[PDB]
Amino acid sequence: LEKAKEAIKEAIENRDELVEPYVERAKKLAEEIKKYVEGGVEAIVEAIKNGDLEVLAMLLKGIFYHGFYGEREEAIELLEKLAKAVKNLEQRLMSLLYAELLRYMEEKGISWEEFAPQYLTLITILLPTYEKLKEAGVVTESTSLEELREIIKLVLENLPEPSELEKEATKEVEPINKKMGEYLSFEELKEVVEGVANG
């Protein structure tokens, strides 16, 4: 809190630099998830337990965009439970980010398409905020989840309007991301997150 004001401010000025990498990464994850969908629950759990960021990022989008089809409560529960289970700080924060997007929509009553352009706006500002605070030693592996959510809600509270590139990229990638969250049911996602925690 407060100690990240210049980190977010500089993050909003460079947010559009992360638009193209996000689009490329999302298109790659859309094909890689099919390999791990055929691999099964045990293949996803073992990969994440051994610190595979890519598989963990695949699972995050699988949980978040599965909530687009309904029952966003369960996606919030799984994203927060997975955040505590994993040890990496970057994906800990990404899991909390997707949970806060769904939590903010339910508490405010915002529909998915009304808030879709703000997904990439929060991602492209919060990610350089994390890197800046990590480069300054403000956040670390011992940083509690409660302080990570304070960073996310601080960016989401002072969230600027989406940029032209973000609105453009949102239309390009939303159909891709929604198909990514159609393979793994909430029951399978429950098994994966439970497998990461104690499997």
Author numbering: 2 to 200
Which text from the study accompanies this structure?
We highlight the general applicability of Riff-Diff by designing enzymes for two mechanistically distinct chemical transformations, the retro-aldol reaction and the Morita–Baylis–Hillman reaction. We show that in both cases, it is possible to generate catalysts that exhibit activities rivalling those optimized by in vitro evolution, along with exquisite stereoselectivity.
The crystal structures agree with the design models, having backbone Cα RMSD values between 0.68 Å and 1.2 Å. However, the exchange Y120F also led to a tenfold reduction in activity.
